[PDB]
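Internal ticket #5521
Category: modeling
Description: The requester needs a full-assembly model to guide mutagenesis choices. All entity lines are attached below as received. Residue total reported by intake: 1464.
Assigned to: D.W.
Attached entities:
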Amino acid sequence: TLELSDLTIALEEFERYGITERMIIVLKNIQKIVAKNCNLNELKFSSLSRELKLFEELLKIPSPPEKIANSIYKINDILESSIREFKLCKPIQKFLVDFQKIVLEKLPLDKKINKYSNIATLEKVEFMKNIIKLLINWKMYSEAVIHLRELLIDIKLIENGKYFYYNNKDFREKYWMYSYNIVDKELPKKIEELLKNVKGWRNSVAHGGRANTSINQKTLEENLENALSMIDEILLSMKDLKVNSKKIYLLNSTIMPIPKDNQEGKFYILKLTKNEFKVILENAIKDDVLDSAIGHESVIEFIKDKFELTVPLKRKEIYFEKGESALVIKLEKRPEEGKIYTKEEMDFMEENNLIGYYYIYREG
Amino acid sequence: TLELSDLTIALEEFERYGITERMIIVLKNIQKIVAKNKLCNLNELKFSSLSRELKLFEELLKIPSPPEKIANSIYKINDILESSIREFKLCSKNSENLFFIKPIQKFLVDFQKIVLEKLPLDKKINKYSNIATLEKVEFMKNIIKLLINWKMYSEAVIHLRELLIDIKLIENGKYFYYNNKDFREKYWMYSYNKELPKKIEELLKNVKGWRNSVAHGGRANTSINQKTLEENLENALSMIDEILLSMKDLKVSKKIYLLNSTIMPIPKDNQEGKFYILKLTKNEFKVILENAIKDDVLDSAIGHESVIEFIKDKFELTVPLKRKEIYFEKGESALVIKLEKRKIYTKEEMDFMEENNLIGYYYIYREG
Amino acid sequence: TLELSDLTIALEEFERYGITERMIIVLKNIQKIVAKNCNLNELKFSSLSRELKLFEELLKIPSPPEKIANSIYKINDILESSIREFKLCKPIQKFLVDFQKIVLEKLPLDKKINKYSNIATLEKVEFMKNIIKLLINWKMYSEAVIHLRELLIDIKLIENGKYFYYNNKDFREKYWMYSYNIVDKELPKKIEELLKNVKGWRNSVAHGGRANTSINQKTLEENLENALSMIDEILLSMKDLKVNSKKIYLLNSTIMPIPKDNQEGKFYILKLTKNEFKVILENAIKDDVLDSAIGHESVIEFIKDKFELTVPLKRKEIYFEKGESALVIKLEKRPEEGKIYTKEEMDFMEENNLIGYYYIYREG
Amino acid sequence: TLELSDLTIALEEFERYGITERMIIVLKNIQKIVAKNKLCNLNELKFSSLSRELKLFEELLKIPSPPEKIANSIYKINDILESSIREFKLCSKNSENLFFIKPIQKFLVDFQKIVLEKLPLDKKINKYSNIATLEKVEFMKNIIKLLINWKMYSEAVIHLRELLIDIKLIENGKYFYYNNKDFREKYWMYSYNKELPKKIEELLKNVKGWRNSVAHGGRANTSINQKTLEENLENALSMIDEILLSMKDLKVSKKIYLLNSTIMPIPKDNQEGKFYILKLTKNEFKVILENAIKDDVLDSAIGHESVIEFIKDKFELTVPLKRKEIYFEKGESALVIKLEKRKIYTKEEMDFMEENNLIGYYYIYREG
């Protein structure tokens, strides 16, 4: 029953304000209509409409970057899948094609983000900068400012070698409240200037313009454009930049030893993805800060096999000093005695989450 | 001519999502039609101002803005709509002009139905732009309800926090700190040591429990979904409704002096004082002034009866004459009616002063 | 009945630990003994013993500098008075003489402090430095540290042109918590270094040495000696130093006008002594920041007569801008119409506190 | 020979004002007399150590110091005194030596009477130097009483604040944060939302009301006199006494694991954790360990029975054997007995390890 009219305005509403209601209505109708006839169930239009509703929700209610990136991935995937299966067999194909173009030109797509969902990364900062641009385009200004603050905190975390504090609320808040150690380098001053600038106006939005501090649309947009420009400059500076490392142990369990003369310790532990583990370890090797304490050669071979990295074998006790770190690979099943993990064993362990990866940091 | 499709979709998009773009397109089209046809002798200045106010109002919702600006914008929209409809109503009708009048009047009436059912309208908000008031809390409660309807969640949460600060200020008799950034922030951060204050504390604790899930972008695994956010907002709105009902009769009173200059005297006993001074509107002066009179807390030190006559004539309030020194104790207040040009001022001259901003109204509070 | 023994150890206890009990006992006995016979009542030994008890109290319980300075003044005065009246007419005279010497060599004496009891001054900083030395000599270490903190705050207040915030608890605390505007000059860096140094160890004493932060006597004494040395260097730097001034109005009432376009104001008012008024005004004239709004020539003549200062006559409205100040001279009695305050009138007004002096500062 | 004047005045000055200078002079004189006359075969090392401990003890009062140091010093003074008196007691007496023994023994006995009536003596404080304990709160209450007696007011107030922090830590089951500067400071700054916690809050509010009158030198017209300070301190000491009585029976329990290594596992469910680790004394391990046993909150994961035998033999406690993985949930704790050199360890070898600091005891707390 849908008139080409309905389709055109559903596309307009999505492209102009990110509104999904009319798109969802049109899509549920399309899948009901083709139910009469391209048969195969790669035509997951109901799942596409569901994902669209969820995506608009993750924009309207401030959500972690990982969730937004994931939603855009799922939408892109379901479109293509459905489009080919359908096309391959009316104006409906045209509508799906026009809708796809928008998606592909407005929604930022980084398929690698969730490989690194637990830590702050430059690619994530870039992605959230583009998402903030999208939010501004859809006139979601208050949301753009909320996300801008967290993006600035991420930049501070990355530059201070604190990417593993990405998900620690206390640490993020401490880093927003407090400034830099005044002791000289250009990049930290750029970052400080950006944070001072944004703090200059952020509460005009964040506090509803009370106490005669309101800000209008043109002013806010200029402020956001300048913040994004400064972010671009900073990201360019940081692309090749190397953040120095103190020691990184490699361990096969999650331990917190302190030196026997120490009275006290404060520790942080972060669960990692295998890709996060791979990147931390590769960097540790190439920066020559890895201090391996892996005793079992089955683990050395597991690492070589699954990550193409070579780690020295070393049976030793370790003790954390303040500021030292550790990578942990916890295999919950050792192999046959004096033997190699077989490929079936490695598959079973991965399939059933029997390999755990962690980052440990001694804060005190 | 106007396409009915276009008018219907502009109305639906505004009513459903608060979007004004298509409304503006339709209105500029009507403006061109009325300019071509000299229709009903209409003041096109006010149709053009309607387009302007609509764009501005959407901005004031999307960028969280003080309640006075939002309220004023809703007032102006209602005003222009009402006068435009009236002009079409009274316009002498004939066969030719009706072709254009019928759909244009219908569109304006339909738009007005949306405005009157969806936009909270309080015409006295802007009389009291410097102080916290119960009516303003009601207004911003209704604005938060509107924002929720249009799926404008983070804007709703920002305003919720400022509404709670307003409630705290009013209950502690600190309505004159409404526009003072530091004191708003102190009142949000800090608690107090009597049913109503427990109700208010209990709203603030509840909101603080989840507010940063939205205010901080849901990082560090604090994300919240739409169903939860909607439940939390509904709970806050209920607590606010109960609290407003309780607060209708409350009396927030210590002594309030009435002075004719901006003075800060302290007792000869005292080593130091901290004072706050707030410029008032003529309406703020008036309402603070009887409340002081009816509460029997007014302590007049107005010396010259030309000022007593200004007060009697322009506010219809009766104030005793008294030439006397006063000293502020900590926590005391004053209303000031200050002639901004310094013996006898005849009342005709004082009227001239009101005429030209030579009468200033102030609230003074000795905070320390 | 008192044995020369008792007198010697009372002197020893006072000189060594500031203990006054034995001195008070000896003094009450002396005045009871001479009650038999130098007759005249300048022999106020009971008042001297009372003052001694009060002075030990003002040392043992942290007290404002004005009170301690006053107690030392009273003690010095009562000693001399009593000594001459008595001497002029036994080993008792010898005891009074030995006691006087101690007082005159151990107790710091600045008779001008209380002329300026409401504001922070370099002479007061010097006096409290010498008092802290006294406290250390009498092994009153915890008291010395409490006083050291307030002395540092006073130095900060003086250097920032904030001497009138001397008695504002909020401002004093803000100045201790917070650092300097990093933007270059040598003296503020000296002050910052002193504050950073003292903050480095102060809580070792201030918090009872808990959480493994205790400090021993030799260490604390070294830290105190270094703090006092830094204070001496800073005082030398500041002796001729000139703290710049924004505008100072001269008013004849305590008013708080703000410009008609301003929405809001925050004001501070401090009650002054006539000497504080004289110094502020003299400085304002010589620095050419005085903006007089005194309309009545009787007031101009009062100021010339009582302070030997010349102030221009000017009838005008004023409005405070942020950061402007005012001196206020409030005469509660105007003179005979178009006439001069007679000398009897000025005396009566001073005698009965009918002249009030104030400092007003617009903080916001 | 000793002058009786000198001995009497040294005793009076110590008893009345806690001053030790003259005591030290008299004691060094006695030491010279005993060295000249080879008196009673006395160990002059311990008379010289008495002079040293007296100087040190005065320092530990005048410079506010942790309770462990003060307690240990009082113990050492009592110990040396008691043994010296005993040696004079048992010394075979004759006509010649008695001329020196009579006044020296009298002086030591008189000094001991002062020590035993005036210095609080708790010999087990130093067994538990890393944790907050009720006995330590009692000890520091008695030390504050002593300090007040000797007119050492600002020292008394500094200690009062730290005593209140200790009470807060104990009542919240956070005794292992005793030596953690940040958490002591957080617990002093922050309140809580049940009679005893209200009593404790009410002590803290009372003290905070006047504490800075002393802690900040009485500036900005906050000075306080001796009469007021004495009343305020007496009121605090009473509230502390009531609170200690209430707290005698309290049970502060969640689960406590027993582990043989310093591990920080979190559930595979969790993204992050924050852990605290505190090195313990053998006595702290022992007392925490039965309290866990008697409270039925111990969850043992000790795998090798050589460790079960170490525990049974050296602490006389019975602990089940269990080889198992554990995961800390937020708020869970563990006791750790760690062999500091990494299959089978015979018990004779483990004894050798205790011998030479190869056995470590730890408390682990998952704070987040």
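Resolution: model delivered.
Comment from assignee: The interface with chain B takes residues 5, 9, 13, 16-17, 19, 21, 57, 60-64, 67, 139-143, 146-147, 149-150, 167-169, 172, 205-217, 220 of chain A (CB under 8 Å).
Ticket closed.
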